[PDB]
Ligand binder design. Structure first.
Ligand code: CLA
Ligand code: CLA
Ligand code: CLA
Ligand code: CLA
Ligand code: CLA
Ligand code: CLA
Ligand code: CLA
Ligand code: CLA
Ligand SMILES: CC1=CCCC(C)(C)[C@H]1/C=C/C(C)=C/C=C/C(C)=C/C=C/C=C(C)/C=C/C=C(C)/C=C/C1=C(C)CCCC1(C)C
Ligand SMILES: CC1=CCCC(C)(C)[C@H]1/C=C/C(C)=C/C=C/C(C)=C/C=C/C=C(C)/C=C/C=C(C)/C=C/C1=C(C)CCCC1(C)C
Ligand SMILES: CC1=C(C/C=C(\C)CCC[C@H](C)CCC[C@H](C)CCCC(C)C)C(=O)c2ccccc2C1=O
Lengths: 732, 139, 51, 161, 34, 162, 107
């Protein structure tokens, strides 16, 4: 009767709904009883420090478990042959065949083999021994403690920040651009130049010697003379064996481009020069805003003055400053949309341009990292649109936003939504129709009749960056071009070697199957956007429910009247778009993984011929690659893919269990539960035990969430088991 | 006015759909009505019972259970003589329906309007306006 | 006395260590562990249910 | 040629596609006697397969490394018969259907009971309308400019937001 | 492995005692009224 | 929770005192016990074939718990079952771990309880505070100096145990 | 059941293309499609589709091509019935195609 102490409406509920709803509304601090704005921003600040610490404890845990139980020192000796160990297994349910089957990695105990790539990342950035992985784990435990104490400290009465501090947009932007983005990128260049570059070249540099070991033989004298090009002189040779002194140069900043020939990763001197460039740029960008000394920009002044004189945007951005600052949901939506695009950039640029030594030969790690970050990307992008819907319901004031960009977006909400409906339908009808055309014609024994459309626009883009496969002779592909001549002395020789060589995932060859799947991804991104945009724009009202704002973000329905109002809330369009997010990241990761496993065999033509129809995707990707995974255990034994073999079935179960919450709805279950309440009260020896909370069926919104969680968890666990076990079992 | 606890009840052979421990520990509802006949009706909680000629008394676990029987008795047997009471475990009897002797669908003097909003529904305040202030969204 | 007496048998006969010579000791310990979990359940029910 | 593709008439992979596709049917024909109805049917299938590959070879289509025809749809006029010209034929028929249906819903609004005209179609009038579609680009553009296609924003029901 | 005893000591504690105890306490806290 | 004698209370101080005096006894007793080799087959590694996967340890040699460690654990399990039975079903006279919600918390002892030479509560609390501190002293001494806890117990008492 | 029954015996439907059993491969894929398409009607509710139809009705009103029989999202019961009908058709058609290509090839 007092668990949701933040909610008296839930704390007086006599049912089991109180526990569920108190657990599910716990982090929605804005909705808590008697919540002021001061207390809202100060609890968010302290709980952001708790998230900071959880991240640091998670990273310290990965470092500790690899330092303790991993084979990092064995792996760094021979990184292409040794399989990295994540942590050991102590499971009292194992049989002795299971214990023997997981005893890989060169150790004497069962282990999980790491798919996270942390070995390649820690190898590349300098770590050599278990002592420094452990030292990193210790330092992160200290930092986690520092940020937990900071979270407690900024909850103390003298140390409580005011709302004037929390909304100082200019000082926060100045410091996050110049200190958090820029100076830490500059400090990361210092780590590469001072530690990672020398230790990639055999010379150990630690805290014990880094003030008496110069990164460059000349040493901070060329920098303080303008002779900066002396830091690019004598780069690492193509004969360099990573981690050793043979083939090593003395340069610490280069723009060679392409990849280190042995590790098949970006040059660490390119990465050090990248973070130096991006650091200075971000530091300069962090001097943009006026704080205390009269130079800089006021964000209010910039936003108010950007109204085009033609009047096409109305009042423009007048009043957008206040809306953004006052609305934490508008900020969360901008932050999550921005972050979601970046983790999609992270997934796309880390497989094509890997930075870590001897990764991109760890095919399981490449598949897991790409799949992981694309799923994180889809979650962040859907959440951005969710919090835009929450912004419109909760924080958007139409009077304060008269004729703005925001009001005028709502004014044409139907033009936006109907054109997203058109483009979704357009793409879906044709992409599916071309795929079905191809399936029917191939089935009828006539593969030639297939509508195979070359991806010429993308091929032109590849050629424009120097791919010579398509013979476009555009820009970099043409030897005598202004673009080619300009970059010839700096990054083009390495880039042309990297792009033209077929040993890397840089600008991988694209054909008709690639075109069709890209259009499928376009239908998926447009359809998820349609559902999310329809939810955000119709969040505050619709013809079916004009006063939808008055009911909130997440409500079940408005009842069976007016024809029926199931899934009418903006939350329910989040709910419906979550399936479309899962479907699109499914199409993306299925495409990435199938194209890569076919290239990794040396059989890229198998994707080229089978991806243009859907039975090729069914038999040649899902059915063909299932066999190492589903044979992880059988009546003839088991091997170390048994865990993924069990997880794959576990994902199928959770996913299907989600269907129970999504297909079967409340009234059936409340009528079951009332017969169980009768039976418990009428059973002798059992009616001595009484519930404190009346058993009720799950709510309409709660069951939609429970089915969505089960569907999503089943989706993730099934695909993670498949993408890891098929790649591990195949090794290619 | 008060519930006469001695009113005889309709002939029901019992059912499992009746009231549970919350009726004897939280609240119970009773419905009384006068019938001109010895006639069979359907229980809200199950099968069929026979209402006796004269005055009948029922014990249900919900007010909707009472009002469901009230509608069945008014549409099929034309009884308009139904009084719905909420009986606390303390023994307090609370008269409920019709609350002032006249049905809610008929106007009655001395009824004060509760929940009435002076404007139409499209003039409700936006949630941003009522955020971080105690002011209500109905204007 | 009733419940503890019959709990030992399923753990002993059908447990992981059933084929071992320590099957009865494992079954008793498993029964005892289940008794401790159940007695914790009885304790927590008593704390919350009854004023 | 275009996009590193080869014309289908000189690609060896298209030729081995045709040869394999004819061998599959010839081994099905090898189990039947000459004048029998299955053999006659199979031979006509072989003739159709050869005609398809012969026509595709001389059509200017470009084959891939897989020996299947690929469509170039970037707008170039040497390949306009694969998307730009079939697309113009589509847009003419699609705009025909759209103009004809729009004309019929505007007719049906001016009826005594408008909704019976949409479940029981006035077939002579609807056939008058299906004949109207052959000059839909001009009819629809004159409709657009004469203020009869687009209704103003203040004549359309919208949600309160 | 060094400290090989710790997985045998902690994994049953973290995996059985920790949930049991925190579930028991969570149950007491959610059910309690004052 | 706190209103039942749990937390930083004198009831908890007394109970942890009792457990630390018993623990100092048990540490001294196991030091004497394995110094003379009176634990049978102390080095013998238990086989997973008899005991199952709970016996696995992952120490590079043997891959199993030793018999000594299992025997000390079984001694602890004996007194844990006594502990649970005493916690849930105490004696009529015994002090109870969880005091009734409405109880009178005993006054805090202070810096030093009054000295009574008999079997008194004050003597129990003094010895208990000393033993809890003693547990910390031995655990830190062994940790700091890189010696087995059994060995530092033996060293403190002048090797009387062994 | 996953490996030795569904995966092992679905070999014939997946590899049926270019043969006389290619219709079963097409119905196998088509029924997987119909089954999945059913879940659009099963996991969603009418109110989403009516507000989406409102935006589409706006686009029709803008071109003066609104129908006189006002488009509605299907009823709540009909959304359930359409989802169940497509689910049964998709599942049974998947099993129908799988069973028939498997046993025509091997039996
Ligand atoms: C230089 C000064 C400075 C610095 C360093 C910070 C730093 C920070 N502040 Mg800020 N802050 C400052 C001044 C500063 N503050 C001032 C002056 C004010 C008052 C006006 C504030 C007011 C303020 C508020 C109100 C809040 C913060 C918060 C935060 C934290 C952000 C959370 C996080 O982890 O992001 C870390 C972000 C990065 C490391 C950069 C992101 C990198 C981008 C996204 C992509 C780069 C990818 C790159 C390859 C990384 C690869 C990693 C590796 C695995 C490959 C962060 C620690 C928030 C917080 O969490 O509270 C603790 C918060 O709520 N600050
Ligand atoms: C392309 C975008 C852009 C635009 C249009 C402006 C425009 C302007 N800036 Mg800003 N500025 C920018 C980017 C931009 N800046 C960036 C990226 C930085 C970071 C280095 C700055 C940092 C900056 C400072 C620190 C100051 C300006 C100032 C000014 C004004 C200078 C007028 C002048 O030179 O008189 C001839 C003008 C309104 C000054 C001002 O008064 O701001 C309003 C000022 O003090 N700028
Ligand atoms: C295979 C599964 C599947 C398929 C095909 C679809 C298809 C579609 N969904 Mg649905 N959806 C699904 C699963 C599926 N969904 C699931 C599981 C969920 C989670 C609940 C959703 C949730 C969802 C939402 C919330 C939304 C969609 C939307 C869409 C549309 C997006 C593509 C588009 O706009 O045009 C593509 C059109 C097609 C693919 C239709 C196929 C064309 C047909 C088959 C022609 C065949 C004619 C033939 C003769 C019929 C024979 C019948 C016989 C009895 C005579 C389309 C109708 C969005 C929408 O309506 O945007 C406009 C939208 O808002 N879907
Ligand atoms: C997404 C990018 C994009 C877009 C929108 C277009 C669009 C177009 N291209 Mg281009 N093209 C592209 C990328 C693109 N192309 C790429 C990447 C290549 C590879 C190098 C080409 C190569 C290409 C060639 C070689 C030609 C086109 C032509 C055309 C036009 C087709 C017919 C037409 O309207 O002519 C105008 C005709 C009318 C308006 C009426 C005619 C009846 C059209 C404007 C053709 C053209 O006309 O060039 C201007 C042409 O000859 N395209
Ligand atoms: C011929 C009549 C007609 C016309 C002119 C339009 C016009 C339009 N519709 Mg379509 N629509 C129609 C019928 C029609 N609709 C019907 C019957 C349905 C139910 C299936 C829909 C469902 C529909 C959806 C779901 C969407 C549109 C959209 C659109 C707009 C974009 C154009 C487009 O891509 O069409 C697309 C057309 C379809 C997807 C369905 C085509 C339906 C058939 C082919 C037409 C029916 C022929 C009709 C029976 C003719 C009978 C007349 C005869 C008696 C003389 C535009 C306002 C889109 C929009 O709002 O974007 C701005 C959109 O998302 N419409
Ligand atoms: C947060 C990251 C994290 C994660 C997921 C794990 C995961 C695991 N650890 Mg732990 N561990 C971590 C960090 C982490 N470790 C750190 C930083 C240390 C250094 C002190 C250790 C030291 C450690 C030891 C010594 C042992 C494990 C063991 C294990 C395994 C069994 C669980 C167990 O007995 O835990 C016991 C873990 C601890 C007592 C240390 C606490 C772990 C972190 C710091 C807690 C952080 C919690 C998280 C941030 C948020 C909690 C709330 C959450 C429920 C929402 C399991 C693989 C056992 C093992 O390897 O068996 C194979 C084992 O014996 N861990
Ligand atoms: C995540 C951690 C975890 C761990 C470490 C264990 C540990 C164990 N499980 Mg597993 N189990 C778990 C989770 C876990 N379980 C979950 C989540 C489930 C549900 C899916 C199961 C379901 C399960 C089954 C169905 C069985 C086991 C069995 C076993 C035992 C291994 C077999 C053996 O050697 O028998 C020797 C085992 C013993 C001698 C039993 C020792 C009894 C302990 C020591 C008493 C502990 C007292 C108790 C925890 C008090 C807690 C009170 C509460 C407040 C915490 C071992 C005790 C088997 C078993 O019970 O063994 C008989 C068995 O049949 N487990
Ligand atoms: C448990 C009770 C106990 C007992 C029986 C003893 C008995 C003894 N201790 Mg002492 N000692 C004790 C507790 C005890 N100690 C405590 C609590 C500590 C602190 C950790 C020490 C620290 C200590 C040191 C540092 C040394 C002894 C030593 C000795 C032995 C010989 C010299 C002597 O008389 O030292 C005088 C007695 C005392 C200092 C304490 C009484 C003697 C048998 C000596 C020895 O041989 O150890 C190898 C020695 O050098 N003791
Ligand atoms: C989700 C969550 C909830 C609320 C909000 C939140 C706070 C922000 C967030 C954070 C959660 C977080 C950050 C949770 C963090 C949880 C953590 C860090 C748990 C760590 C546990 C470590 C243990 C139990 C080790 C004990 C070691 C011992 C006893 C060794 C002792 C010893 C040995 C043998 C050797 C030395 C001597 C002695 C002393 C004898
Ligand atoms: C719903 C909602 C309600 C209101 C609040 C809200 C939260 C804000 C909102 C959410 C909105 C959301 C969730 C919005 C999400 C918005 C997103 C994801 C926008 C993506 C923008 C990407 C751009 C502009 C890429 C540009 C690349 C370029 C120009 C590359 C150029 C090039 C370069 C340099 C290199 C290559 C060559 C070329 C190609 C020339
Ligand atoms: C897509 C969808 C709609 C919209 C679907 C509509 C409006 C159906 C319209 C489809 C076109 C207009 C006709 C369908 C014709 C098909 C090509 C074949 C139909 C075969 C029989 C109808 C004869 C709902 O109304 C709905 C309601 C409740 C739960 C889920 C949903 C749901 O998922």
């Amino acid at each position: 009767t007092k668990f949701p102490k933040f909610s008296q409406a839930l704390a007086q509920d006599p049912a089991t709904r109180r526990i569920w709803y108190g657990l599910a509304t716990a982090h929605d601090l804005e909705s808590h009883d008697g919540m002021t704005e001061e207390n809202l921003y100060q609890k968010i600040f302290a709980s952001h420090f708790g998230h900071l610490a959880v991240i640091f404890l998670w990273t310290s845990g990965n470092l500790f478990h690899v330092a303790w139980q991993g084979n990092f020192e064995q792996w760094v000796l021979n990184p292409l042959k040794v399989k990295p160990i994540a942590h050991a297994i102590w499971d009292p349910h194992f049989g002795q065949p299971a214990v023997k089957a997981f005893t890989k990695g060169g150790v004497s105990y069962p282990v999980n083999i790491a798919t996270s790539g942390v070995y390649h990342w820690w190898y590349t950035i300098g770590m050599r021994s278990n002592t420094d992985l452990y030292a990193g784990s210790l330092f992160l435990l200290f930092l986690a403690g520092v940020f937990l104490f900071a979270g407690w400290l900024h909850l103390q009465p003298k140390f409580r920040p005011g709302l004037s501090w929390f909304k100082n947009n200019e000082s926060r932007l100045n410091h996050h651009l110049s200190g958090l983005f820029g100076f830490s990128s500059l400090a990361w260049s210092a780590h590469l130049i001072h530690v990672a570059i020398p230790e990639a070249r055999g010379q150990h540099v630690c805290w014990d010697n880094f003030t008496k070991v110069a990164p460059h033989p000349a040493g901070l004298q060329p920098f303080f003379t303008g002779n900066w090009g002396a830091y690019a002189a004598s780069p690492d040779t193509t004969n360099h064996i990573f981690g050793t002194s043979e083939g090593a140069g003395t340069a610490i900043l280069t723009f060679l481009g392409g990849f280190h020939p042995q590790t098949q990763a970006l040059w660490l001197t390119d990465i050090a020069h990248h973070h130096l460039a991006i650091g200075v740029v971000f530091i300069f960008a962090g001097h943009m805003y006026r704080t205390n000394w009269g130079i800089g920009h006021s964000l209010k002044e910039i936003l108010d003055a950007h109204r085009p004189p033609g009047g096409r945007l109305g009042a423009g951005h007048k009043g957008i400053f206040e809306t953004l600052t006052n609305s934490l949901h508008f900020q969360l939506g901008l932050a999550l949309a921005s972050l979601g695009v970046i983790t999609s950039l992270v997934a796309q640029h880390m497989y094509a341009l890997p930075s870590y030594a001897f990764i991109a030969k760890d095919y399981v790690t490449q598949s897991a990292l790409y799949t992981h970050h694309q799923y994180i990307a889809g979650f962040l992008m859907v959440g951005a649109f969710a919090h835009g819907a929450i912004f419109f319901v909760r924080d958007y004031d139409p009077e304060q936003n008269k004729n703005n960009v925001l009001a005028r977006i709502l004014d044409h909400k139907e033009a936006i939504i109907s054109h997203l409906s058109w483009v979704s339908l357009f793409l879906g009808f044709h992409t599916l129709g071309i795929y079905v055309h191809n399936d029917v014609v191939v089935a009828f024994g006539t593969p030639e009749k297939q509508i195979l459309v070359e991806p010429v626009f993308a091929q032109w883009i590849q050629a424009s960056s120097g791919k010579a496969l398509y013979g476009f002779d555009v820009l970099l592909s043409s030897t005598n071009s202004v673009a080619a001549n300009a970059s010839s002395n700096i990054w083009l020789p390495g880039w042309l070697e990297a792009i033209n060589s077929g040993k890397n995932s840089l600008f991988l060859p694209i054909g008709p199957g690639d075109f069709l799947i890209h259009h499928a991804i376009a239908l998926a991104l447009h359809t998820t956007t349609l559902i999310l945009v329809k939810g955000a724009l119709d969040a505050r009202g619709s013809k079916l429910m004009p006063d939808k704002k008055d009911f909130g973000y997440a409500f079940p329905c408005d009842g069976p009247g007016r024809g029926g109002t199931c899934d009418i809330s903006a939350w329910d369009a989040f709910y419906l778009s979550m399936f479309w997010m899962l479907n699109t990241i499914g199409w993306v990761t299925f495409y990435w993984h199938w194209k890569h496993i076919t290239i990794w065999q040396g059989n890229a033509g198998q994707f080229n011929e089978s991806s243009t129809y859907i039975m090729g995707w069914l038999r040649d990707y899902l059915w063909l690659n299932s066999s190492p995974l589903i044979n992880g255990y059988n009546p003839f034994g088991m091997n170390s893919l048994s865990v993924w073999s069990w997880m794959f079935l576990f994902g199928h179960l959770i996913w299907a269990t989600g269907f129970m919450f999504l297909i079967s709805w409340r009234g059936y279950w409340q009528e079951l539960i009332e017969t169980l309440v009768w039976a418990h009260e009428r059973t002798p020896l059992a009616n001595l035990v009484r519930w404190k909370d009346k058993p009720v069926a799950l709510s309409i919104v709660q069951a939609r969430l429970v089915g969505l969680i089960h569907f999503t968890a089943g989706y993730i666990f099934t695909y993670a088991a498949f993408v890891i076990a098929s790649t591990t079992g195949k090794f290619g | 006015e008060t519930l006469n606890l001695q009113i005889p009840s309709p002939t029901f052979e019992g059912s499992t759909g009746g009231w549970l421990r919350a009726a004897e520990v939280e609240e119970k509802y009773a419905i009384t009505w006068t019938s001109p006949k010895e006639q069979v009706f359907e229980m809200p909680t199950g099968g069929a019972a026979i209402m006796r000629q004269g005055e009948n008394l029922l014990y249900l676990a919900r007010k909707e259970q009472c009002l469901a029987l009230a509608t069945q008795v008014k549409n099929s047997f034309k009884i308009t003589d139904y009084k719905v009471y909420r009986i606390f475990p303390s023994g307090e009897v609370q008269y409920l329906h019709p609350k002032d002797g006249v049905f809610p669908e008929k106007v009655n003097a001395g009824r004060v309007g509760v929940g009435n909003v002076s404007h139409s529904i499209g003039k409700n305040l936006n949630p941003a306006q009522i955020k971080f202030t105690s002011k209500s969204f109905n204007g | 006395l009733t419940h503890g007496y019959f709990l030992v048998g399923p753990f002993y006969k059908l447990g992981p260590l059933r084929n071992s010579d320590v099957a009865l000791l494992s079954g008793f310990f498993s029964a005892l562990g289940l008794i401790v979990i159940l007695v914790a359940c009885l304790t927590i029910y008593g704390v919350v249910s009854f004023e | 040629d275009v996009a590193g593709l080869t014309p289908c008439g000189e690609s060896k992979e298209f030729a081995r596609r045709l040869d394999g596709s004819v061998k599959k049917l010839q081994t099905r024909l090898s189990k039947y006697e000459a004048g029998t109805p299955p053999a006659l049917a199979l031979q006509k299938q072989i003739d159709k397969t050869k005609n398809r590959f012969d026509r595709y070879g001389k059509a200017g289509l470009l084959c891939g490394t897989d020996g299947l025809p690929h469509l170039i749809t970037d707008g170039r006029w040497t390949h306009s018969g694969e998307f730009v010209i079939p697309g113009l034929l589509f847009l003419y028929v699609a705009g025909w259907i759209g103009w004809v249906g729009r004309s019929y819903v505007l007719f049906a609004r001016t009826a005594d009971k408008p909704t019976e005209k949409e479940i029981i179609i006035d077939v002579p009038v609807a056939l008058s309308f299906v004949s109207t579609g052959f000059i839909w680009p001009f009819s629809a553009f004159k409709e657009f400019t004469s203020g009869n296609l687009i209704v103003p924003a203040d004549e359309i029901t919208v949600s309160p937001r | 492995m060094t400290a090989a005893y710790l997985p045998s000591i902690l994994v049953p504690i973290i995996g059985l005692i920790f949930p049991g105890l925190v579930m028991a306490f969570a149950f007491i806290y959610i059910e309690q009224d004052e | 929770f706190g209103g039942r004698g749990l937390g930083v209370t004198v009831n908890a101080e007394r109970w942890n005192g009792r457990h630390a005096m018993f623990g100092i006894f048990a540490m001294v007793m196991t030091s004497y016990m394995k110094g003379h080799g009176l634990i049978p087959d102390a080095d013998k590694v238990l086989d997973i074939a008899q005991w199952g996967p709970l016996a696995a340890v992952w120490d590079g040699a043997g891959n199993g718990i030793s018999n000594e460690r299992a025997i000390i654990l079984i001694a602890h399990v004996h007194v844990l079952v006594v502990s649970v039975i005493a916690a849930i079903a105490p004696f009529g006279f015994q002090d109870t771990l969880v005091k009734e919600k409405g109880y009178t918390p005993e006054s805090p002892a202070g810096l030093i309880p009054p000295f009574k030479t008999g079997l008194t509560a004050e003597a129990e609390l003094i010895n208990g505070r000393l033993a809890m501190l003693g547990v910390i002293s031995i655990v830190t001494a062994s940790l700091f100096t890189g010696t087995s806890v059994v060995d530092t117990i033996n060293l403190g008492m002048g090797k009387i145990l062994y | 059941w996953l490996r030795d029954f569904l995966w092992a015996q679905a070999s014939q439907v997946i590899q049926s293309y270019g043969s006389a059993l290619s219709a079963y491969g097409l119905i196998f894929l088509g029924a997987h499609f119909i089954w999945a398409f059913s879940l659009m009607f099963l996991f969603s509710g009418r109110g989403y589709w009516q507000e989406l139809i409102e935006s589409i009705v706006w686009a029709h009103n803008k071109l003066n091509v609104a129908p006189a029989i006002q488009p509605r999202a299907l009823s709540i019961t009909q959304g359930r019935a359409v989802g169940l009908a497509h689910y049964l058709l998709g599942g049974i058609g998947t099993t129908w195609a799988f069973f028939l290509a498997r046993i025509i090839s091997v039996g």
